[PDB]
Amino acid sequence: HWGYGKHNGPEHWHKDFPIAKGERQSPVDIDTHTAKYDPSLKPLSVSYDQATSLRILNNGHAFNVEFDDSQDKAVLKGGPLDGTYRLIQFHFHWGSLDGQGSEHTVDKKKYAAELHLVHWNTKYGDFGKAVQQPDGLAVLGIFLKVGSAKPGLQKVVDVLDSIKTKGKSADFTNFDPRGLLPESLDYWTYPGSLTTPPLLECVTWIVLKEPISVSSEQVLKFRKLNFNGEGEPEELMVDNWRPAQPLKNRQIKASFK
Ligand SMILES: COc1ccc(N[C@H](NS(N)(=O)=O)Oc2ccccc2)cc1OC
Ligand SMILES: [Zn+2]
User: Fold this and answer.
1) Cβ contacts of residue 249 below 8 Å, gap of 6+?
2) Could you name the active-site residues?
3) Of the residues 24, 57, 194, which should be mutated to test ligand 1's pocket, given the most ligand atoms within 8 Å of the CB?
């Protein structure tokens, strides 16, 4: 029964999921003056041309766009990664106001929202097996700032009315995730975890330097979603982000000098 409120939010999660106070938790603050250029990083390859989106779902915490991951249709390779990682879904975290919403921060700076593209390591055969491994997942994180509209985000925005409440889903085929990327693929990378319960420490984080711009109108439609189920009292789906966690014994590396 976890959530983001006073009584079931991030400060409570450790009781059901003790790993919340683990050695490799996410998100983290990215101190740009402590992260180091790593020349050993190979180029990052985002290969989404044949992506096959299936559906969108309000899971009571965020909304998920899910993809067909039965083959290597949309994959992330290179960068810090060994092998091939298949896209399984994306989702966002966002705020009640534009001054907050992201999970990662950059020199303590909070963005309005954060996009998570979730991929699993094909050497482990399925997602469930992957989340039992220290290198099972790779998540591509993209910051959102408010300014001009993001054209590739509008189709997402325009389906949200049809999935306002928990448990609601809609057909969401022929959506191209390439329309959510910034120009530049400059990133920071570090080893971490899922930022939601069960907070598994299986993730290679790849966080893009360059934010994308979304319109106020677009983010306002995110804030119209509901945490609650149909016919329940309205709890707006806002501030579904986990704050920064201790870096502990970890190095954040930059792919750019
Ligand atoms: C196919 O199964 C999964 C797919 C994806 C994630 N990741 C993800 N959160 S995050 N920030 O760690 O990536 O899950 C949630 C959860 C609630 C709201 C929003 C995103 C977790 C999954 O099973 C645990
Ligand atoms: Zn996430």
Assistant:
1) 23
2) 61 (proton donor/acceptor)
3) 194
